[PDB]
Each structure stands twice: as structure tokens, then as C-alpha cells.
Design a protein around this ligand. Structure first.
Ligand SMILES: [Br-]
Ligand SMILES: [Br-]
Lengths: 330, 330
């Protein structure tokens, strides 16, 4: 038997409860590949799936965790054999299916990627969906003409999970990074990832009546959304793009069409969940090459399965800095 | 001396009046190239500059008209000489600078493009800023993977200027074009341009509480904006893109970020005004090749300078179908 985080729900009442529990192999859903999980992580979505559910989990009891990395235990699929190191992000694992907060996980072989060269299973989850999303965002900006030397790139929610990898990848590629945070004590941490400028959240988290402001940002990785994304749109330089990745600041988008029409701005939707295999390999290769491992190490916060109920709650309130690494075998 | 439409402003009350007037060459602002204008047209913005101004005109008296085409009369720039057929769209002509609603116009040589192969000056203005914008929208969707055979492409405000041209281009390139209109009597016109479905404005002109609806549209050219654009974002297929082109339905964009995050949807800003020389040539070549001239002809509504006050009022109310062609020399 083995350890896993299990969420139960009281349907009469609707309340949920998450606890570490012992399971057997036969309690897992059947699948092509069985992985002995070595590491997982905590994303904002995991926070939802650990606690309230946010309408993302449709079957209880539930093992959350949208990410994991580990070693293949058994497989009925040619692509993977016992011993192979593999990473799982997204594919609705941790939401529609049992996920990574477990010493063992069963998945479809289509959902896995080989462990990328230059990362171990621990760093792969230090990156996680948050870091993978950050790389997809940077790639979207590059595909739309972003190159260093044409103004600061804004990174909202910069001290969080997506923001910390975004900041470090962009800094390492040679960009000037303007890191947004509502908590000024995070400045030294952000500067140590490579932030050049620190923007206060309260400068930029309300809409204003003017549909256009002074052109400032050469690009943006938006891990916040909400009113702040609406306000940010009116401050992008002509022809610059914003990569939308986050909704912690709220799902609503109180924007105007004026930045798009008058300044040729783009709002680019970043989805990590359903990324095709080939693009997953490309983004992971870019992370291997463009995210300095010592910068990733400075983000890492260790945790066990027992910590997950507290960490899940904390990340929903924006009180988790950097990237949590869950040693499911600790 | 020669004829032009002049708008006067009564800055006390703030109300304007437009009328045909006789100018001399010396009344025109100085510039590098003098063009004997042959044709202009009526864009939504021209309606603003003809009438109330919409914050776009900062010096009266004002000759409006953001577009014109004709023959170079004199030139102090080596790029153009007497006799060259030239086309003007945008560059803030008709807004910041006296425009095409005149038998003669002075411009910077930087603002002109040679008359494109396959169009005469009349057809260039039947296309106009509106059609130029529609091609840029089609090009933006292509650059993001739009290709025939994967669903209908929505064109909002289909019976207007941008919408008519976009419809005909997309239909000629082999797409199924879903054409939005509030005027059901215009179905036969839209079918004649190549629309394969007619969609009623009232089905899609309000937001709904759900942030995602069923995936329908392979892409969109949006000449309306406002609530309709917010509603359309939630109906786009995974990874599909919207080319934002218009604001006749309102400048406010009451959207959510959910389509961008969950479906990888893009909102691509189309700016015609400041497009660089090289891309203008590319887009005009595409128009000459992919807008069938007989479809363009079916859009044409003839007009003279004296028609401009009424048409300017008409286009602001959504009461102009197709594309006006102004013979400034009739
Ligand atoms: Br923030
Ligand atoms: Br419409």
C-alpha cells in the first residue's frame, strides 16, 4: 500500500475534506502506464482541487495534483518501459482524473513526456505547470516579434509560481523585466530572479476611464488577469502582445477594444492543459536551455503530502511565493 | 480653383457644419506630393470626421476623408513624379490632416503607395480603408493557422464596409463564411458575396453568464466590437483567433479571460492607420488577387462630394450597405 492525498465531499452539505490516506494499487483508475511518483508541486489550480473544487472536480473521492514526475513501474504501451523517467503536466490529470498527490499514478501513455535532458524529476516539478505555462507565454511573445532592447517586459503576479519562472527566463534571455507585486518585501527575491524594475500592484490593478495611457510595455506575461489585465492593455506599446495565463485577479475582463484597434495590440491565450506532444517537447527543451537551474533552485519551497491542505488554501489567497516541490515519498 | 468638402466648427456651441466649397491650391497645407484626387470613399471614421468629430479632429476648418486615390500632379520627392497613379489610406489623413474629400490633396511621399497591379483608382477606393482592414484581418487569421475545412469563419456586421470585403475575400479563398446582420432583408446581398450562413445579430449581441459556450467558429473578423465581441470570444473553437477591427457596437469590451486560458483563443488587434510601407504593399497585392473584382463591384454605391454630409450621418447609424465610391470630379 502507499500514501496519497484524498479529498472527500459531503454532498448534502457540499463541504470537502482533504487528508493523507493509504491506498492500494487497485484503488487507482486503470491505465496504460503506472508511475512510481517521485515529485509533484502546487499550482493555483491544485489549490482549487484540494479544497473547494472550483467546479473542476466532478468525481469524489479525488486524488488531486495536475503535475507529477517519476519512474515508470509498468506499461502496456511501447513508448514507455519500466525504469523510464517521465513527466506529467495537465491533460486534465488532477481534475477529471486522479493525479500526482500519490506515491503511484496511472495515466495514458499519450499524456507523458520523456524526462527532458538536463532536468531531474525534482527540477521538472520545480518547473511544473506554472513554469511550463511561463515558457509557453514567452514563446508566444517571441512568435509575435518580441526581442530584447525595446522596452520593459511586464510580469504581473511576479512573485508567484508562473511569475517567478517568467521573470527568470526573460531576465536570462536578456530582457528588462518589470515585476509586479502587492508586497514590497518580495522585491529582493524578485531582483534575485532577474527583475530590473519593481512595479507596485496598486499602481495598476484598477481600470481607468481613459481607454489609452502612455505606451510603456514591450510585452507582458499576465498571471493575474482581471482588472489589472484590462488596465495593462492600455499601456502596451504599439504592436506589443500580452500573454494571458492567470485569473487569480478574477475571471472578468473589463477591457475596451481601443488598444487592439488603435495600437495593434494582441491578447494571446496560453493553455497548458491540452498542449500537443510535439510542442510540449519543444517548450521543455527551451526550459532546459533558458531557465538557469540555480535560479529555479531559489524559487523552490519543499513540502510533503501532509502540507498540501495548508498550501492549497494559501496559494488561493496569493500567499505562496515561488514554486512548491512535493516529495511524495518523504 | 477646385471643390472640396469643408467642415466648420462653431466652438461656442461646439456644433459643426459640412459643405462643398471652392478652394485654391494655396489653401491646402504644404506637402511633398500634390495629388489630383480621382476617388475617395466613406469609412465609419469619415462619418465621425464629417459630423461631430468624435474627438478625432483638432483643427477646423477641416477637409475630411481618410482615403483617396488619383494621379500625382507635382512632387518634390523622387519616389513619385507627375502622372504616377497613387493610393492613400490612413496615416491620420482626414483626421490630423486635410484629406481626400477634395479634388486635390497634399501628402508626404511616405504616406502613399503606388496603385497596385490589377486595380484602377476607382477599385482602390471601392476597397478603401475598410477593405484594406479586412485583408489585414484575413492575413492575421492566416498567420495564426486559419485554413479552410475546419469550421465557419464568423464575420460580424457583414453587410457594412469591412464586413462585405471580408466576406468576399474569405468566400473566394474557400472558407465557409457565417455573416452576422440585424437586417434580414440583406441575406440575398450577403449570399451574393459568398456568405454560406446568415446569423442574426440578436442571437449574438449580448453577453451571457456562462464564460464558455459550445465551440463553433474557426475564426472571426469582428467589425462590431462591444458586447458582441465579448460574446463571440466564448464561442470560438480551441486555438481560434478573432481579428478585432471595429467598435460600431461600442468601445467597451465586457469579456472574461476564460476563453483565452481554457481554449488558447487569441484577440488580434488590426490597425490600418499606421501600417508600414512594406506590409501595405503586401496587403494590397493580396486584395488584387483574392477579392474578386465583380464581388467588389456589387458592393459599390456611387456618391459625390455633396452627398457626404448625409452619408456620414448614415454610416454612423449602421445605414450604409457595402462601400461608397466618391467621384470627387463628377
Ligand atoms: Br500582483
Ligand atoms: Br451585425
Amino acid at each position: 500500500m502507499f500514501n496519497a492525498l484524498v479529498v472527500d465531499k459531503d454532498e448534502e452539505s457540499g463541504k470537502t475534506q482533504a487528508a493523507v490516506k493509504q491506498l492500494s494499487l487497485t484503488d487507482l483508475p486503470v491505465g496504460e502506464v503506472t508511475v512510481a511518483v517521485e515529485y509533484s508541486t502546487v499550482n493555483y489550480k491544485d489549490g482549487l482541487c484540494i479544497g473547494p473544487g472550483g467546479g473542476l472536480v466532478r468525481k469524489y473521492p479525488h486524488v488531486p495534483g495536475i503535475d507529477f514526475a517519476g519512474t515508470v513501474e509498468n506499461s502496456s504501451d511501447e513508448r514507455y518501459k519500466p525504469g523510464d523517467k517521465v513527466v506529467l503536466t495537465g491533460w486534465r490529470v488532477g481534475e477529471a482524473h486522479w493525479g500526482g498527490y500519490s506515491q503511484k499514478a496511472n495515466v495514458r501513455a499519450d499524456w507523458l513526456v520523456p524526462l527532458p535532458e538536463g532536468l531531474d524529476t525534482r527540477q521538472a516539478m520545480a518547473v511544473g505547470t506554472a513554469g511550463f505555462t511561463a515558457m509557453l507565454a514567452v514563446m508566444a511573445l517571441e512568435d509575435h516579434g518580441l526581442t530584447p532592447g525595446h522596452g520593459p517586459v511586464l510580469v504581473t503576479g511576479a512573485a508567484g509560481g508562473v511569475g517567478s519562472v517568467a521573470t527568470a527566463i526573460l531576465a536570462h534571455l536578456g530582457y528588462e523585466v518589470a515585476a509586479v507585486t502587492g508586497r514590497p518585501e518580495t522585491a529582493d527575491y524578485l531582483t534575485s530572479l532577474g527583475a530590473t524594475q519593481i512595479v507596485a500592484r496598486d499602481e495598476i490593478n484598477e481600470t481607468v476611464k481613459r481607454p489609452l495611457e502612455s505606451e510603456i510595455w514591450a510585452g507582458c506575461v499576465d498571471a493575474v488577469g482581471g482588472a489589472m489585465l484590462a488596465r495593462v492593455l492600455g499601456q502596451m506599446k504599439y504592436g506589443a502582445s500580452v500573454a494571458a495565463v492567470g485569473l487569480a485577479g478574477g475571471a472578468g475582463l473589463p477591457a475596451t477594444v481601443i488598444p487592439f484597434l488603435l495600437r495593434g495590440v494582441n491578447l494571446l491565450g496560453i493553455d497548458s492543459v491540452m498542449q500537443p506532444y510535439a510542442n510540449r517537447l519543444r517548450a521543455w527543451e527551451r526550459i532546459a536551455r533558458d531557465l538557469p537551474m540555480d535560479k529555479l533552485e531559489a524559487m523552490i519551497r519543499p513540502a510533503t503530502l501532509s502540507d498540501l491542505p495548508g498550501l492549497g488554501a494559501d496559494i488561493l489567497k496569493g500567499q505562496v511565493q515561488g514554486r512548491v516541490v512535493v516529495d511524495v515519498n518523504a
